[PDB]
């Protein structure tokens, strides 16, 4: 049984019920259509969440500040479905580029475990400041099939 993928919600249910749940009860999460997008997180001085829609699926994009930053992508779907994708997270700044590429986690795997193992893009504040505008950080997120 699947739990709410948003990084104060104690909702549980089927996999097919996840998207309806997010749409009705978390109306404030923005969704973007496209396989190559910019996740522009504002005021990095905390969780930011959006959804990216492509290849007929929805991916939850999360940036968390615990200081260190963790950026991760998770498929609203099964592990089997997730294994058909690759995601890329890129920070770009003045003649510097940091890139992280992996298989998206299923929401069943959650992101606590991936975060605790630094299995995602991990960067600290000095780095965040370095790629960021005025406390705004643009992450280029690209999803592809394999």
């Amino acid at each position: 049984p699947y739990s709410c993928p948003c990084p104060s919600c104690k909702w549980q249910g089927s996999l097919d019920a996840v998207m309806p749940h997010l749409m009705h009860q978390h109306k404030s999460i923005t969704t973007l259509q496209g396989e190559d997008i910019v996740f522009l997180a504002t005021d990095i001085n905390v969780d930011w969440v959006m959804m990216q829609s492509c290849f007929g699926f929805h991916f939850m994009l999360v940036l968390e500040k615990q200081q260190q930053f963790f950026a991760i992508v998770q498929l609203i779907g099964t592990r089997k479905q997730a294994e058909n994708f690759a995601y890329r997270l890129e920070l770009n700044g003045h003649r510097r580029r940091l890139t992280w590429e992996a298989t998206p986690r299923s929401i069943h795997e959650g992101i606590a475990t991936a975060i605790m193992n630094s299995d995602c893009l991990v960067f600290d504040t000095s780095i965040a400041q370095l790629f960021a505008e005025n406390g705004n950080l643009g992450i280029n997120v690209t999803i592809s099939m394999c």
């Binding site: 923005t30 496209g34 997008i37 996740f39 522009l40 997180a41 504002t42 005021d43 930011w48 280029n140």
Partner: peptide, 9 residues
């Protein structure tokens, strides 16, 4: 590319 301007929770 499309961009989403995202505020913090």
């Amino acid at each position: 590319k499309p961009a989403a301007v995202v505020a913090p929770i």
